[PDB]
UniProtKB/Swiss-Prot annotation, chain A:
The DNA polymerase activity domain resides in the N-terminal half of the protein, while the C-terminus is necessary for complexing subunits B and C. The CysA-type zinc finger is required for PCNA-binding. The gene is POL2. This is DNA polymerase epsilon catalytic subunit A. It comes from Saccharomyces cerevisiae (strain ATCC 204508 / S288c) (Baker's yeast). It comes from the Eukaryota. It is found in: Nucleus. Disulfide bonds: none annotated. DNA polymerase epsilon is a heterotetramer consisting of POL2, DPB2, DPB3 and DPB4. Catalytic component of the DNA polymerase epsilon complex which participates in chromosomal DNA replication. Required during synthesis of the leading DNA strands at the replication fork, binds at/or near replication origins and moves along DNA with the replication fork. Has 3'-5' proofreading exonuclease activity that corrects errors arising during DNA replication. In eukaryotes there are five DNA polymerases: alpha, beta, gamma, delta, and epsilon which are responsible for different reactions of DNA synthesis. Belongs to the DNA polymerase type-B family.
UniProtKB/Swiss-Prot annotation, chain B:
Keywords: Cell cycle, DNA replication, Nucleus, Phosphoprotein. Signal peptide: none annotated. One of its GO terms (cellular component) is CMG complex. The keyword Nucleus applies. Assembles into a complex with MCM5/CDC46. Interacts with MCM10. One of its GO terms (molecular function) is single-stranded DNA binding. PANTHER family: CDC45-RELATED PROTEIN, CELL DIVISION CONTROL PROTEIN 45 HOMOLOG. This is Cell division control protein 45. It is found in: Nucleus. The keyword Phosphoprotein applies. GO terms for biological process: DNA replication initiation; double-strand break repair via break-induced replication; mitotic DNA replication preinitiation complex assembly.
Amino acid sequence: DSMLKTKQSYLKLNSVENSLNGFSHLFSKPLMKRVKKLFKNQQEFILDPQYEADYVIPVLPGSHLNVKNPLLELVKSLCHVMLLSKSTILEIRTLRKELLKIFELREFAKVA
Amino acid sequence: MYYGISQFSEAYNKILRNSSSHSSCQLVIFVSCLNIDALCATKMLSLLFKKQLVQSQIVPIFGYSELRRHYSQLDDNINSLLLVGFGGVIDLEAFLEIDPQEYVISFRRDIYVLDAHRPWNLDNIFGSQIIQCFDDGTVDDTLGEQKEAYYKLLRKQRKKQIHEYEGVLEEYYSQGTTVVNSISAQIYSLLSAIGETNLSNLWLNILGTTSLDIAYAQVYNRLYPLLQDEVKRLVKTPDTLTLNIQPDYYLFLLRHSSLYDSFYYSNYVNAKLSLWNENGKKRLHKMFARMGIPLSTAQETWLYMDHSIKRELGIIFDKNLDRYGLQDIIRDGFVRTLGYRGSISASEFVEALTALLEVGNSAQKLTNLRKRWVSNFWLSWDALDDRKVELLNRGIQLAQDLQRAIFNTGVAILEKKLIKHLRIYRLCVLQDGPDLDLYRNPLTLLRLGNWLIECCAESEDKQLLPMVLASIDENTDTYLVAGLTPRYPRGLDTIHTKKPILNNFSMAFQQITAETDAKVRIDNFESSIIEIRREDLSPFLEKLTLSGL
């Protein structure tokens, strides 16, 4: 929705393209607050036995990666989907570093 | 009590009645590895049982799992079994599923548990005649009330008695794990009652009693006068063996390293003068100058260092140390001399032994570590005899190296300020750094933590908080966590020593593991040390924060 809105606004105005540049400014703070809340809840209820059902990582044919923390893959996918821009790289990288700062990780770490 | 001190010899006689045979090994001993008092008691027992030609076997174990497995390995031919250094605070019958009717014949195979931890199992005492221990003199006085409820609890208004008994049992439980007496002390008391005391036995008793100076200074001060009186009761020819009460100081290998390095590495002076920054070194140099020893002289080996100032060292210390307030460094100790070989002291010898235990030579790697620990224990055991000194010089140099490494890591910790001050307990984690592979040893980790707690105590902070310390071994991807109790300043009066600070970390760990399904492995004989997973650490810690301590 945000990308559609910014493209429409740019078209109304008239390797970088201002059609999409500046689209992540719409949803930054709510996303960060939601990620913090998710991290807190996961930290609180990961070891509970009755809540162990919803944290089970599903197994599918062709799956080979063995990893532990689900929120990490959630944010990794949510950032890799944005990184496909090929024209707004720097803004995405700043957002990704800010997201990774919530965890005690680093920008170029292997696990990230 | 089951066996009072006034009847120990009788139990000894029982062993001779049951295990003294010709062609049958009818006595096996389990020893708490990675402990010094257990080693001293085991050496004393081995000598005693070699005297009367009683065949025996010594078995080192590390964890409760090995205890269970080796007990399952046992055969009924063994009339008597020994356990030293552990197994006091848990019920072995519920642990090893002993059927009293299986063994009755009497109960056949006797088991002798010999430990010191005071919150030890009440049922394991009053409910079993198969299991039988050596009370230090605790049941006859302290437990004068707890046993009544157990005896009673082993028409609608009688529930008050049941409630009172349950409350009494609960009050007795929920207390910290502490040690109030030494195993070697009781062994030497039995030896004195029998009449087999000699210089080797006295030396081993002294070692056992002095291994506790670091952590249980109250016990050490309670036990010192007996040792002093006993050593008083008991030309330099090449066969002289002299035991002396010579002055000694809280100094790291004073008689084998230069005096400068001794002051520099001594933990007490470190804590008192903050030698991890520059002002500490400046004050140290001021102290040396005011004493008058040259900086080139003080950096020479103790053998070649000047004889006149060697003689005058006592007066120099007496006249100088007062300004810096380090006069609590002077104490009275024991020195053993063997002909022309040289001189040694109890503190140096036990530090050498500890270092030799530390350094010497998933499931598979853990087993390899637990087996090299036993190998190092046996090497330290062999190092005891007077026919070997090349296994003591190596120990001394390794102690120097280990203390240097510990100091190098501690200065980095205090520089980076990783010590996080929570509301209840302090916390610090060694996420990354140098020489992390050394700290896989619980005793090395305890040494580091002892230095850290000394440093924290020797400050202006007026809060006594438990400390939690963690490490990492990337091979297993697990955190090794140990809980540490606060310590009072050493130079403190005895009036504020009504009760030693207890340790509730074992209870907290067991409760959290019972209430949640963490991936931990609690198998150390020291119940305050556990292993946890990297991904599981942080929520676990949260739980420990939110739980009642």
